[PDB]
Amino acid sequence: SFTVEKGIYQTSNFRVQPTESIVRFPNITNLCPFHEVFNATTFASVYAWNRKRISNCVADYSVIYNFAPFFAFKCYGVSPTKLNDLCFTNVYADSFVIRGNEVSQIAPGQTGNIADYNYKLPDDFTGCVIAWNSNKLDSKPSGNYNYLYRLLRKSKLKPFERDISTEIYQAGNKPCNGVAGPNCYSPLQSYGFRPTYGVGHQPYRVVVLSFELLHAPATVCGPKKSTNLVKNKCVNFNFNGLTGTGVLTESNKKFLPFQQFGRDIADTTDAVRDPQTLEILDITPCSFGGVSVITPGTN
Amino acid sequence: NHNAQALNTLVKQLSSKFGAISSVLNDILSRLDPPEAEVQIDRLITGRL
Amino acid sequence: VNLITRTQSYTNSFTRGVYYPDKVFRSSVLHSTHDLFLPFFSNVTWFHALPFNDGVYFASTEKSNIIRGWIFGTTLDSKTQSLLIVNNATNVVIKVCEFQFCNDPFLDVESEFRVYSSANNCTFEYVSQPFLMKNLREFVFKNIDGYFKIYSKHTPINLERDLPQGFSALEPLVDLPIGINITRFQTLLALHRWTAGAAAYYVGYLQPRTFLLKYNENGTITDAVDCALDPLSETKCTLK
């Protein structure tokens, strides 16, 4: 309205703005062995897949981009262009070789021989899948038979389960008794790789990365650079991935040598320890409130 | 007692996920991309409303 | 090389076997937590291959240092990995190598040939300050989501033939990233050489339970309530 009567009215709210930003990433300078996982010149069969654990190192992904043009680079729970800033607890890497047309089988909630008898992913998977052609490396002109896949199994495979049993499968009532007779077939089938094969049957190297987010104090991060520490000001902070804004003050809290954070009745963060210097600091929200306007009548 | 209980329940309701990956907007903003954060944000908005 | 005979007895656990669930600081609050705990007033075994199940609570009170380290494995064979923990005067060694263990692995004091025939393929090795240090030592071991978590506590105690009555939270000791199955476990003994002595310990098993823990203003847990023990505790948990 263009006319206001005498009284007091609530119009809007105000909040103190932040001053600067604080970064307190750890100071380890190791390089995660991503280069060793790739271009290893030897990739195990799909029915027995390698599993490597990565932790306690600074993870960089720039080498991946310049490694090779990718048939598939699909990240499910994380945007692929932001992996250079997050911080994870532990990294899992699984590498193997599979046929070209079966790449689509590697995905959460999928079906197929490889999906149910070779390698099964969980429904809540949070990671990335990388698949690139390797026809020029693992395709003998006469035929490479070192790569084998399981074909017959009694039941499905649970997520992240590996089977290496090699026994004659029995598809009938009579027992195989240890011979490859009728109704009895070998469990493993050998791939045939030749350079003359068309696309869809040439071998492809696949690497699956699995993360562990929102867990114990994380270790796998740090492409960025840390900053100094300020107190008694409305500032932004990033402590090992814990991001926020507020005022940092000295804390008289008796932290046990194994706790990292602090919580209250409302279950919100109110204390934290600096990774570089072991010191407990209290966090307080910056000032905010409402604004009221008092005026007589416009007349 | 009633006033304190009501305020405590209202504050405690902020930690529910309502069917999203997390209950904190700050991480989702800094962990995902714009074209896919709205799906997670909508459920939190509905629950808090 | 068999010089050991084990006798069984049964006793009451009372309110023992409480550990800090996470690494989050709290004060002057009551917190509800659902996790694997030792049920209150449970039925623990006294010993003078045991299944691992979902976790093990171990208790000892002997000072003669006869107990040192443990063996964890599914088939206890060199065909599969098996955790081996050895505590000694200077350090503690933890290995996951597929050792070919013997029927009755006992330390010679210090040749390990009697414990296992040979070492082989493995990836993880750990060396640190020894876990061990009138004294009661309580330990909690659990393997979950590819992590072997070990909690422990050491407490002075008077001359008592059974477990004391009180509260003592078990601070975390270690969380090893191994990621292997565990089905059976065995206790290692060190006999001077070849005298055969005697040792005793308490064994209990963990179960999934909901507990109400009380934090003091000062960083420590001082009380706990098992919600499924009786109607009174259920009412206490409901009323928080």
Ligand SMILES: *[C@@H]1O[C@H](CO)[C@@H](O)[C@H](O)[C@H]1NC(C)=O
């Ligand atoms: C504990 O269990 C044993 C056998 O499992 C039983 O004989 C005994 O009565 C139970 N109770 C006590 C208090 O030992």
Ligand SMILES: *[C@@H]1O[C@H](CO)[C@@H](O)[C@H](O)[C@H]1NC(C)=O
């Ligand atoms: C105790 O264990 C440590 C750790 O391996 C070892 O270096 C030391 O030699 C051991 N002491 C004896 C007496 O064997």
Ligand SMILES: *[C@@H]1O[C@H](CO)[C@@H](O)[C@H](O)[C@H]1NC(C)=O
């Ligand atoms: C250990 O495992 C590897 C991998 O399968 C195998 O090649 C080796 O023969 C095994 N035994 C020893 C003693 O390394």
Ligand SMILES: *[C@@H]1O[C@H](CO)[C@@H](O)[C@H](O)[C@H]1NC(C)=O
């Ligand atoms: C461990 O042993 C159990 C029972 O023998 C078996 O089902 C399982 O596949 C084995 N491996 C793992 C990683 O649990």
Ligand SMILES: *[C@@H]1O[C@H](CO)[C@@H](O)[C@H](O)[C@H]1NC(C)=O
């Ligand atoms: C609590 O901690 C403070 C500071 O360490 C101390 O003054 C007090 O005695 C402690 N109370 C206990 C341990 O009951």
